[PDB]
Enzyme design. Structure first.
Site, PDB file in Angstrom:
ATOM      1  CB  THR D  90      45.098  48.221  47.421  1.00 53.32           C
ATOM      2  OG1 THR D  90      43.905  48.153  48.208  1.00 53.32           O
ATOM      3  CG2 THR D  90      44.747  48.749  46.039  1.00 53.32           C
ATOM      4  NE  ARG D 101      38.218  56.568  40.364  1.00 56.71           N
ATOM      5  CZ  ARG D 101      37.091  56.852  41.018  1.00 56.71           C
ATOM      6  NH1 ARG D 101      35.936  56.941  40.356  1.00 56.71           N
ATOM      7  NH2 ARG D 101      37.116  57.055  42.335  1.00 56.71           N
ATOM      8  CB  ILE D 202      37.762  47.650  52.514  1.00 53.09           C
ATOM      9  CG1 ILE D 202      38.917  46.685  52.785  1.00 53.09           C
ATOM     10  CG2 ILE D 202      36.511  46.907  52.097  1.00 53.09           C
ATOM     11  CD1 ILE D 202      40.204  47.359  53.216  1.00 53.09           C
ATOM     12  CG  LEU D 203      36.284  50.670  47.211  1.00 53.24           C
ATOM     13  CD1 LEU D 203      36.057  51.022  45.726  1.00 53.24           C
ATOM     14  CD2 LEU D 203      36.405  51.924  48.034  1.00 53.24           C
ATOM     15  CG  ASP D 278      32.675  34.030  37.686  1.00 53.45           C
ATOM     16  OD1 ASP D 278      32.995  35.193  38.008  1.00 53.45           O
ATOM     17  OD2 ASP D 278      31.605  33.726  37.113  1.00 53.45           O
TER      18      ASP D 278
HETATM   19  C1  LIG Z   1      36.008  41.954  39.687  1.00 57.22           C
HETATM   20  C2  LIG Z   1      37.266  42.319  40.372  1.00 57.22           C
HETATM   21  O1  LIG Z   1      38.262  42.717  39.792  1.00 57.22           O
HETATM   22  S1  LIG Z   1      37.198  42.156  42.038  1.00 57.22           S
HETATM   23  C3  LIG Z   1      38.426  42.747  43.133  1.00 57.22           C
HETATM   24  C4  LIG Z   1      37.776  43.203  44.401  1.00 57.22           C
HETATM   25  N1  LIG Z   1      38.868  43.471  45.293  1.00 57.22           N
HETATM   26  C5  LIG Z   1      38.712  43.798  46.587  1.00 57.22           C
HETATM   27  O2  LIG Z   1      37.611  43.898  47.131  1.00 57.22           O
HETATM   28  C6  LIG Z   1      39.974  44.074  47.405  1.00 57.22           C
HETATM   29  C7  LIG Z   1      39.596  45.128  48.429  1.00 57.22           C
HETATM   30  N2  LIG Z   1      39.442  46.450  47.882  1.00 57.22           N
HETATM   31  C8  LIG Z   1      40.557  47.178  47.672  1.00 57.22           C
HETATM   32  O3  LIG Z   1      41.659  46.694  47.962  1.00 57.22           O
HETATM   33  C9  LIG Z   1      40.526  48.608  47.094  1.00 57.22           C
HETATM   34  O4  LIG Z   1      39.609  49.455  47.784  1.00 57.22           O
HETATM   35  C10 LIG Z   1      40.104  48.830  45.646  1.00 57.22           C
HETATM   36  C11 LIG Z   1      41.167  48.414  44.635  1.00 57.22           C
HETATM   37  C12 LIG Z   1      38.813  48.067  45.374  1.00 57.22           C
HETATM   38  C13 LIG Z   1      39.884  50.346  45.550  1.00 57.22           C
HETATM   39  O5  LIG Z   1      41.064  51.046  45.922  1.00 57.22           O
HETATM   40  P1  LIG Z   1      41.023  52.545  46.441  1.00 57.22           P
HETATM   41  O6  LIG Z   1      42.433  53.007  46.576  1.00 57.22           O
HETATM   42  O7  LIG Z   1      40.130  52.502  47.639  1.00 57.22           O
HETATM   43  O8  LIG Z   1      40.314  53.434  45.345  1.00 57.22           O
HETATM   44  P2  LIG Z   1      41.002  54.602  44.502  1.00 57.22           P
HETATM   45  O9  LIG Z   1      42.400  54.778  45.069  1.00 57.22           O
HETATM   46  O10 LIG Z   1      40.764  54.545  42.990  1.00 57.22           O
HETATM   47  O11 LIG Z   1      40.078  55.738  45.073  1.00 57.22           O
HETATM   48  C14 LIG Z   1      38.729  55.371  45.351  1.00 57.22           C
HETATM   49  C15 LIG Z   1      38.100  56.347  46.325  1.00 57.22           C
HETATM   50  O12 LIG Z   1      38.578  56.232  47.659  1.00 57.22           O
HETATM   51  C16 LIG Z   1      39.321  57.406  47.988  1.00 57.22           C
HETATM   52  N3  LIG Z   1      40.479  56.899  48.749  1.00 57.22           N
HETATM   53  C17 LIG Z   1      41.705  56.474  48.387  1.00 57.22           C
HETATM   54  N4  LIG Z   1      42.400  56.059  49.510  1.00 57.22           N
HETATM   55  C18 LIG Z   1      41.613  56.211  50.565  1.00 57.22           C
HETATM   56  C19 LIG Z   1      41.671  55.991  52.011  1.00 57.22           C
HETATM   57  N5  LIG Z   1      42.772  55.493  52.601  1.00 57.22           N
HETATM   58  N6  LIG Z   1      40.564  56.310  52.732  1.00 57.22           N
HETATM   59  C20 LIG Z   1      39.439  56.812  52.181  1.00 57.22           C
HETATM   60  N7  LIG Z   1      39.328  57.033  50.873  1.00 57.22           N
HETATM   61  C21 LIG Z   1      40.351  56.760  50.049  1.00 57.22           C
HETATM   62  C22 LIG Z   1      39.574  58.144  46.668  1.00 57.22           C
HETATM   63  O13 LIG Z   1      39.495  59.566  46.817  1.00 57.22           O
HETATM   64  C23 LIG Z   1      38.340  57.787  45.917  1.00 57.22           C
HETATM   65  O14 LIG Z   1      37.254  58.581  46.369  1.00 57.22           O
HETATM   66  P3  LIG Z   1      36.601  59.648  45.374  1.00 57.22           P
HETATM   67  O15 LIG Z   1      35.913  58.803  44.318  1.00 57.22           O
HETATM   68  O16 LIG Z   1      35.690  60.343  46.362  1.00 57.22           O
HETATM   69  O17 LIG Z   1      37.749  60.474  44.802  1.00 57.22           O
END
Ligand SMILES: CC(=O)SCCNC(=O)CCNC(=O)[C@H](O)C(C)(C)COP(=O)(O)OP(=O)(O)OC[C@H]1O[C@@H](n2cnc3c(N)ncnc32)[C@H](O)[C@@H]1OP(=O)(O)O
Ligand SMILES: CC(=O)SCCNC(=O)CCNC(=O)[C@H](O)C(C)(C)COP(=O)(O)OP(=O)(O)OC[C@H]1O[C@@H](n2cnc3c(N)ncnc32)[C@H](O)[C@@H]1OP(=O)(O)O
Lengths: 213, 394, 213, 394
Positions: D90, D101, D202-203, D278
């Site tokens: 993202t 998700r 970022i997670l 991988d």
């Molecule tokens: C094996 C593979 O496919 S590997 C790919 C790994 N990729 C990466 O590491 C790229 C970096 N990570 C990212 O870009 C992204 O965080 C992702 C895709 C991993 C997750 O995207 P997110 O938008 O953060 O998650 P999503 O929108 O589904 O929501 C996840 C949580 O964060 C929350 N959230 C969404 N946006 C935000 C924000 N700006 N700040 C804080 N929390 C947020 C949501 O409420 C949710 O929390 P909850 O479970 O308490 O409801």
């Protein structure tokens, strides 16, 4: 004291080899001139030779909007001229690039542009002067000379946009870092050192039997 | 006592080792902390020095440490010293087994006993002052011309030197000692590829942190005073969390925070010190670019640092800080056996690269790096490492 | 069909420019020959000109044992010769390097070596044939021609060792990857493209007033 | 139902989006798992394909996903499919807020409903079969000569094509579905520099792992059967430790381990699958070099992988594995609106780079990357994205 001798000598050599290289370079520039002349002649009888080369050259399409290809396709002819042949007033690395577009109905005029690139003192950077060209009538929205205020919030928006097409390249100068066309000097160098000098190698490849090259 | 005493005191008995103590030439440099214009006390001078160490066992290198010492001068007798620890590294090519932890701690004790006036004798200024000088502003042509008129005129090609341009200072033998470091584990710091050595033992985030913290705990006791101020900080962690590590510390006064607190000028840029290769320097300069230097409180600084990946996607790292007075009074101009002070940046770098520059995915490089150092000290410097008779029971 | 014309044409050009470049290159090789001739002449009257250049060139000392400098210091003269001048049988990039050592009492003989480097087919790698030289009497321990068995555990040890000195370079060939001198082709290229062609620039720098350059 | 149904089902109602579904051309390739010579059943053929997705909101891209589907053929009706998930990313340039998700989970459902026979129609062989052919083995001179004799002879410069060289296969609509992925968080995967965007979330290690695991948990329920075999693995962690995460999983059968167990051939190289980019592929090839491929048990493989830095000095990463049968019978040849299948590697790559290749430290790039894609599909492919009316309450 024969040591004071040998030292004064080398120092002469040192100031010389600077002007010696300008020579080995002026040689190649001369040798090449008529060769490109012959070749270009042939090219000039091939249809869509340039249209084909520019769409096959992979790196090229990174620098410019995708929409630019409708106009890019129109490119009858591209000529590179090294300025160091027309007066020792010019950096061996200075050169001009002439293009020919054959335009399109009710959108793009037919034209021929020559932008000029030469180096400027300070190891020396490459730079350009702006040169006129008739942007397509679609690029009205993002035309610089159609935008009242470039500092207005919707004006800097639209300007930044047209600055990313190839036409925004013709304004590039290399003196307004961050303000003009992005990497405009690299692009110019692409043309002058790869696209024009190998335009043939690419046309051959695009001519591969079976969709997958 | 001598460095040589120290190391021997922490190596297994009967055992023989060799070690290198390279030390740069104290250079007058810019302020450790970025000064603010309109400010009453801004430093008079900052005196940088680099200490670099490397142990040898059986003609193989296996450990090296890179620490910078900075001595700041506000005026006549208002002084202050700071020990920064940049890099320590091992390559697992030691045949015998040793406490890298006590080696490191010791080496630091030793640097801690050094009289800050040692760094004050000669100081290569930041910009020096009859012409006819060859310099980084002299084409080869020029220089040659010069050597020619200097020969046709004098019998030789050299000049006069009395030549004193080389600064000199003094301060109180006992000053404010500080120590700063930033734990971050990595595959290797000073021994390239040595991570491709199996027998090499890497500490992870939370493993490094306790290691380091034990070395400082030991020091705060043995070397510093009982009101010394010690701080720990663990980015992306909880003030409750830290206090729980800290409750492991024998030292009483360990607190959460850092030693740059200072309610005077509550703005990051004018508090955060700037060190080689440091994340603190890193984030700082990052904000120089995206222009936020006059916008982030020291308070904020910490909070933002934790995000912005790096920390966000790396194991445990911690910032430790010390600020106190030493028990004994530091007072030790080191012997030629204690240090080795290259003639120049050029030579200094030269000898360091014999080690840091080598490949270590094979005991070949570590053997190489040793010989190439002794060969070289002997050849170009008429010197040689220090031999060590280890004297530590068990 | 005028299209079958233009195509046959370009194809001629294509096979030509390969031989055209061999020309612009043979030109510079010729222009340079006598210039180095003059210069070397001067150099040849300077004492410890080479001793000085090799110890100042920073990159150089990465490739060779530190102990090698006692012998390296003895280097009266270094000459680079491009083979493409003595017969079109030679790659424009082929060349030889001649050294002169003036030895030392009861350890290093006085000698002069020329190793030859030319490219071999397969974009073409650079390679070398072995050439004789009298290793110092200290390097007895790590002399290849003093080691009974290189496959013996203490023999491969000692061999690998002497292979890291500059003398182990003279054996290098670029055909026993991992078995000979490390990076021997890069080193040779160092000499041929930087050390020899700028040997002066470095001597000037080492001549800086004040210990700190 | 269509992909278009799916996404719309998980986007806020009334809201409009656009998305790209690029799909490579199914190419006959080498075995997913490295075969052993002397082995009864070795694959007959391996059919690779790439699915690539990218969502758009208000003429900005904000999300993209890269998954490979591999369909293996042992014989007439002994088949097997594997879904591998490589990258999701993202750039935080979405104006509105959405559940990345459920977007991801959905997209996978959809790929899961696809009838494996879709991948079986035409298959670009690994090495194809009257001469006169221009090809990667034709100098420009040659080629030109050829075009010349082909013109002097025929009226034109093209040839005959009936032309059928392009493989074709079949298997049972219901086969062994697998899913494999390796969670590792990084600043960005498909959107360069987007980590320089503040609003980008970022997670971390343990944050990604639960995220992913929820997506698979949801799938094992809704899409797979009640005896499906699901496994988790967390390098550098304790079998007790994992079971504790797993106790969070609604699915009953989640176990510690992986789906490559197989008591038949107890040797790593012949079990570990090999995927793009991988770590499993990584470590494997590492052992190809240092020659240990015929020496590390699958058992050992895991144990060694954990050390050797990477994992040793990186946050939580986990390997999830699935192996079961789908509830419904997969049976969906996707519409032209469901996929977009470039003419070539060349064009495929071309369109992907419009996104993956852009800089994202500024909403500029994300705007750029969108326009440049629609402009391009329209121009060179007479097509355009899919518009989405979001229909999910709250
Ligand atoms: C094996 C593979 O496919 S590997 C790919 C790994 N990729 C990466 O590491 C790229 C970096 N990570 C990212 O870009 C992204 O965080 C992702 C895709 C991993 C997750 O995207 P997110 O938008 O953060 O998650 P999503 O929108 O589904 O929501 C996840 C949580 O964060 C929350 N959230 C969404 N946006 C935000 C924000 N700006 N700040 C804080 N929390 C947020 C949501 O409420 C949710 O929390 P909850 O479970 O308490 O409801
Ligand atoms: C701010 C800075 O200065 S940053 C520098 C950071 N540097 C690095 O990350 C480089 C990588 N790390 C390393 O090279 C090294 O692990 C060091 C220097 C950090 C630590 O070295 P070590 O030799 O592991 O530690 P040391 O020898 O003092 O012993 C530490 C522990 O490991 C044990 N140990 C020593 N060798 C090994 C081994 N091969 N395997 C397992 N344990 C070992 C010791 O018993 C001790 O454990 P204990 O506390 O239970 O007695």
């Amino acid at each position: 004291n024969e040591h004071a001798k040998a030292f004064l000598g080398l120092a002469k050599c040192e100031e010389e080899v600077d002007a010696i290289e300008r020579e080995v370079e002026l040689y190649r520039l001369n040798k090449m001139k008529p060769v490109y002349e012959k070749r270009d002649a042939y090219i000039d009888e091939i249809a869509e030779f340039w249209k084909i080369v520019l769409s096959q050259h992979v790196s090229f399409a990174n620098y410019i909007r995708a929409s630019d290809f409708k106009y890019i396709d129109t490119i009858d002819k591209i000529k590179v001229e090294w300025l160091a042949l027309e007066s020792e007033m010019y950096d061996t690395r200075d050169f001009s690039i002439t293009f020919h577009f054959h335009g399109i109905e009710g959108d793009f005029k037919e034209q021929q542009v020559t932008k000029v690139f030469q180096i400027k003192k300070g190891d020396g950077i490459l730079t350009s002067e702006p040169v006129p060209i008739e942007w397509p009538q679609s690029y009205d929205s993002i035309n610089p000379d159609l935008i009242k205020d470039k500092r207005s919030p919707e004006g800097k928006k639209k300007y930044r946009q047209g600055m990313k097409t190839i036409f925004g390249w013709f304004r590039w100068t290399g003196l307004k870092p961050g303000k003009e066309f992005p990497h405009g000097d690299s692009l110019a160098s692409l043309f002058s050192e790869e696209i024009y000098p190998f335009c043939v190698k690419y046309y051959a490849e695009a001519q591969r039997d079976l969709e997958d090259e | 006592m001598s460095l040589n005493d120290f190391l021997s005191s922490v190596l297994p008995v009967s055992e023989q080792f060799e070690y290198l103590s390279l030390q740069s030439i104290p250079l007058e440099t810019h302020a450790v902390v970025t000064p603010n214009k309109d400010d009453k006390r801004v430093p008079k001078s900052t005196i940088k020095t680099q200490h670099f160490f490397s142990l040898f066992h059986q003609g193989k290198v296996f450990f090296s440490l890179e620490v910078y010492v900075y001595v700041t001068l506000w005026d006549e007798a208002d002084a202050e010293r700071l020990i920064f620890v940049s890099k320590a590294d091992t390559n697992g090519y030691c045949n015998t087994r040793v406490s890298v932890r006590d080696i490191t701690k010791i080496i630091l004790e030793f640097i801690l006993s050094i009289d800050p006036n040692y760094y004050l004798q000669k100081v290569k200024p930041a910009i020096r002052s009859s012409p006819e000088l060859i310099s980084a502003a002299s084409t080869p042509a020029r220089t040659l011309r010069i050597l020619a008129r200097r020969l046709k005129q004098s019998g030789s090609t050299v000049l006069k030197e009395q030549q004193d341009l080389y600064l000199s200072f003094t301060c109180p033998r006992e000053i404010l000692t500080k120590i700063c470091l930033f734990t971050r584990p990595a595959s290797q710091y000073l021994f390239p590829d040595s991570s491709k050595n199996s027998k090499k033992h890497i500490l992870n985030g939370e493993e490094l942190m306790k290691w380091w913290g034990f070395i400082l705990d030991r020091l705060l006791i043995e070397c510093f005073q009982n009101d010394t101020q010690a701080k720990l900080r663990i980015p992306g962690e909880d003030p409750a969390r830290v206090r729980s590590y800290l409750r492991g510390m024998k030292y009483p006064l360990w607190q959460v925070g850092d030693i740059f607190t200072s309610k005077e000028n509550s703005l990051a840029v004018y508090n955060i010190p700037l060190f080689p290769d440091d994340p603190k320097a890193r984030f700082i300069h990052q904000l120089a670019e995206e222009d936020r230097l006059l916008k982030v409180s020291l308070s904020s600084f910490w909070i933002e640092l934790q995000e912005r990946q790096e920390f966000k996607l790396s194991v445990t790292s911690s910032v430790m800080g010390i600020s106190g007075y030493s028990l004994a009074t530091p007072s030790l101009f080191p012997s030629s056996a204690d240090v080795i002070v290259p003639k120049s940046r050029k030579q200094f770098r030269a000898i360091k690269k014999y080690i840091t520059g080598e490949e270590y995915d094979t005991e070949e490089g570590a053997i190489e790096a040793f010989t190439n150092i002794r060969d070289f000290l002997l050849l170009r410097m008429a010197t040689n490492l220090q031999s060590l008779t280890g004297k530590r029971e068990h």
